[PDB]
Amino acid sequence: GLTEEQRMMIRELMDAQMKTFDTTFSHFKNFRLPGVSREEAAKWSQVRKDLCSLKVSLQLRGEDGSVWNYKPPADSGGKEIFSLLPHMADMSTYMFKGIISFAKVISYFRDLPIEDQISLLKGAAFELCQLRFNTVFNAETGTWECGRLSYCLEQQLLLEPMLKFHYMLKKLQLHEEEYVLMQAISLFSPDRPGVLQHRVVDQLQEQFAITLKSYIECNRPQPAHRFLFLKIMAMLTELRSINAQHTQRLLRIQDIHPFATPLMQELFGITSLTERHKILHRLLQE
Amino acid sequence: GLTEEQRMMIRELMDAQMKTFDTTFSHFKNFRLPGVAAKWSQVRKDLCSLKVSLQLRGEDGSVWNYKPPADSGGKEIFSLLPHMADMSTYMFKGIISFAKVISYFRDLPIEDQISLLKGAAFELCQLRFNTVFNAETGTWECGRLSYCLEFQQLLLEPMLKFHYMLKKLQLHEEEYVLMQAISLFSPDRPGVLQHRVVDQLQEQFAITLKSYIECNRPQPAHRFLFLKIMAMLTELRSINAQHTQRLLRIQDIHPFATPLMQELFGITSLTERHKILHRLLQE
Numbered sequence: 130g131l132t133e134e135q136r137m138m139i140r141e142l143m144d145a146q147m148k149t150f151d152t153t154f155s156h157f158k159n160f161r162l163p164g165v166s167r168e169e170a171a172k173w174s175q176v177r178k179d180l181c182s183l184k185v186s187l188q189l190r191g192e193d194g195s196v197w198n199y200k201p202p203a204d205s206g207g208k209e210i211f212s213l214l215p216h217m218a219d220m221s222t223y224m225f226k227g228i229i230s231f232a233k234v235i236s237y238f239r240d241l242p243i244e245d246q247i248s249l250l251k252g253a254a255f256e257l258c259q260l261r262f263n264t265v266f267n268a269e270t271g272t273w274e275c276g277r278l279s280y281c282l283e284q285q286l287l288l289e290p291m292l293k294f295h296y297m298l299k300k301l302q303l304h305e306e307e308y309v310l311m312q313a314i315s316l317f318s319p320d321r322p323g324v325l326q327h328r329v330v331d332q333l334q335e336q337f338a339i340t341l342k343s344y345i346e347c348n349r350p351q352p353a354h355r356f357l358f359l360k361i362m363a364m365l366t367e368l369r370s371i372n373a374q375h376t377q378r379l380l381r382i383q384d385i386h387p388f389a390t391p392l393m394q395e396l397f398g399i400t401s402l403t404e405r406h407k408i409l410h411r412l413l414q415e
Numbered sequence: 416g417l418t419e420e421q422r423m424m425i426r427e428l429m430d431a432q433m434k435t436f437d438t439t440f441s442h443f444k445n446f447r448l449p450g451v452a453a454k455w456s457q458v459r460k461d462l463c464s465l466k467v468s469l470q471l472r473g474e475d476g477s478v479w480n481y482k483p484p485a486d487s488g489g490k491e492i493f494s495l496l497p498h499m500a501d502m503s504t505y506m507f508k509g510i511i512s513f514a515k516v517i518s519y520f521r522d523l524p525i526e527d528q529i530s531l532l533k534g535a536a537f538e539l540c541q542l543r544f545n546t547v548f549n550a551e552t553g554t555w556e557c558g559r560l561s562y563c564l565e566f567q568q569l570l571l572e573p574m575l576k577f578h579y580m581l582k583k584l585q586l587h588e589e590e591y592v593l594m595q596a597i598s599l600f601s602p603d604r605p606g607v608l609q610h611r612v613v614d615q616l617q618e619q620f621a622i623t624l625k626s627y628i629e630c631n632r633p634q635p636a637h638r639f640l641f642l643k644i645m646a647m648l649t650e651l652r653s654i655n656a657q658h659t660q661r662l663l664r665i666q667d668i669h670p671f672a673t674p675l676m677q678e679l680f681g682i683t684s685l686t687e688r689h690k691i692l693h694r695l696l697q698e
C-alpha cells in the first residue's frame with residue numbers, strides 16, 4: 130500500500146510510542162493530591178475565569194477495590210480555586226517527560242541541532258500531551274481513564290475549546306498509527322519560536338503529512354474517509370490555537386499563584402537556549 | 416417538680432457535657448486515613464457486618480469520599496482500623512475530660528476513677544455518637560467527617576440496632592447526659608472498691624432522670640420512657656461485653672489499638688498498669 134520508507138517511518142513512530150507512552154499510568158506515582166489593588170484584582174478576576182471554565186472530579190481506585198473520590202470546591206473567593214493545581218502540575222510533568230522521551234527516540238528528531246530540539250519541544254509539549262490524553266478519553270462518560278486515576282468532567286462543556294477538541298477528535302475513531310502521525314506533524318512544526326533549520330523541519334513535516342494521507346488511502350474504505358486527512362489537519366490547527374490559549378492561561382495563574390514544576394517553567398518560559406533550559410538539555414542528552 | 420439538688424445535678428452534667436463534647440469535631444486532627452487458625456473466619460465476621468463509607472468535607476466546599484473494598488480476604492478488611500482507632504481515642508479523651516469535671520467523680524480515689532473509666536468508655540462513646548446519628552440516612556454526622564452505612568440484615572448487628580432503637584426515643588440532651596452518668600457510676604465494674612458510694616451515686620442520677628421525665632414528658636408517645644432508657648442501658652452493657660471481645664479478637668490477628676485503647680481494653684499496680692489514664696486524670 131504505502132512505500133517501504135512510509136512503512137518504516139510509521140514503524141519508527143509506533144516504536145517510539147510503545148516505549149514512551151505509559152498507557153496505564155503505572156509509573157505515575159508519588160504525586161500531590163488536594164488536601165483533606167486595582168491591577169491585581171483584574172488579574173484575580175481573569176485567573177478565576179481561566180480555572181472555573183474546566184471542572185473535573187478525581188477518582189483513585191485502589192488495588193484492593195477501595196475508591197477515593199475528590200469533588201472540587203465552589204468559587205468562595207480565595208485560594209480554594211487552586212486546590213487541584215499541584216496535582217495537575219505533577220500529571221503534566223509526568224506526561225511531558227514521556228513526550229521528551231518520545232521525540233528523543235525518533236531519528237529525524239535526534240539528528241537535528243539541540244537548540245532546534247529544545248524549540249520544537251517547547252512549542253509542541255502541550256499539543257502532544259492532549260493527543261496522548263485523547264487516547265484515554267471516554268466520550269460516553271466524559272472521563273480520561275488514566276489507569277487507577279480518572280478525571281471526570283462535571284453544550285456548556287462544548288463551549289470550552291479544550292473539551293470540544295477531545296469530543297471531536299474521539300468522534301474520528303483514529304487508529305494508533307494516525308494518532309502517532311498527528312504527534313510527528315505537530316512536533317516537526319517549522320513555524321515555532323526559535324526554530325533555526327526551518328527548511329529541514331518543513332520537509333520532515335511534509336513527509337509525515339504525505340505518509341498520513343497515504344496511510345488513510347490504503348487502510349480506509351471509499352469514500353466515507355475521503356476527507357479524514359483534512360479533518361485531521363483541521364484538528365491540529367485548532368490544537369495549536371488551544372496551545373496559544375493554554376500558554377496565556379498558565380502564565381496568568383503562575384503570575385499570581387506559583388505552581389509550575391521546574392520542567393514546566395522551562396517549557397513555558399517562566400523565570401543561550403541550553404543555558405535557559407538546563408533540565409531539557411539534561412533530559413535530551415541522557 | 417424538680418428539687419434544687421436535682422436541678423443543680425442536671426446543670427453540672429450539662430455544663431460538663433458542653434465543656435468536653437466537641438460536637439462539631441473541630442479539634443479532631445492528624446488522624447490516619449485508608450491509603451490511596453479459625454480465628455480469621457470469625458474476625459472477618461466481626462468486621463463485615465459494620466460496613467461504612469467515609470466522607471470528608473473541606474472548609475472550601477471540597478469533598479473527599481472513601482468507598483471501602485469488598486472481602487476475600489485479605490488484609491483489605493483492616494483499611495478503616497487505624498482511622499477508627501484515632502476517632503475512638505479522640506472520643507475517649509472527651510469522655511475522660513467529661514468524668515474529670517464531675518465533682519461526684521473527682522471525690523473518688525484515683526483507682527476507682529480508672530476502674531469506672533475502663534468499664535464505661537465505650538458505653539459513653541456510643542451514647543455521644545447516638546446524638547450525631549441521623550437515622551433517616553444511617554450516618555454519624557461528626558462535623559466535617561461523615562460515616563455512612565453501606566434492612567433486617569443491618570438490624571442483625573446489635574450495635575447498629577441500638578443506634579436506631581435509641582434514636583427512636585427522641586431523647587433530650589439532659590436525658591442523654593443522665594444516661595452517661597448512670598453508665599459511668601456503675602458499682603458492678605471490675606476493680607471498683609467504693610461499691611456503696613458508686614451505687615448511691617447511680618441511684619440518685621436514676622432518681623433525677625425519672626423526676627426529669629415526669630416533669631417534662633407528659634405525652635402518650637413518652638409513656639414508660641424512664642424504663643425504656645433503663646432497658647437500653649442494660650442493652651448497652653451487653654453490647655459493651657460483646658464489643659470488648661470483638662476488639663480483643665481483631666487486635667490479636669491485627670494490632671491496631673492506640674496506647675489509650677490498650678489501657679482501657681486491657682491489651683498488654685492499677686496506676687502503673689494505666690500510666691496514660693493516671694496522667695490524664697492528674698492533668
Ligand SMILES: CC(C)(O)CNC(=O)C[C@H]1CN(S(=O)(=O)c2ccc(F)cc2)c2ccc(C(O)(C(F)(F)F)C(F)(F)F)cc2S1
Nearest residue numbers: 180181183184185201202210213214217218221273280379
Ligand atoms: C475552581 C476549580 C476547582 O473548578 C478550578 N479548576 C480546576 O482545578 C481544574 C483542574 C483540571 N484541568 S481540566 O479540567 O482542564 C482537565 C482535566 C483532566 C485532563 F486530562 C485534561 C484537562 C486542568 C488542566 C490543565 C491545567 C494546567 O495546564 C493549567 F493550569 F491550565 F496551566 C496545569 F496542568 F498546568 F495545571 C490545569 C487544570 S486545573
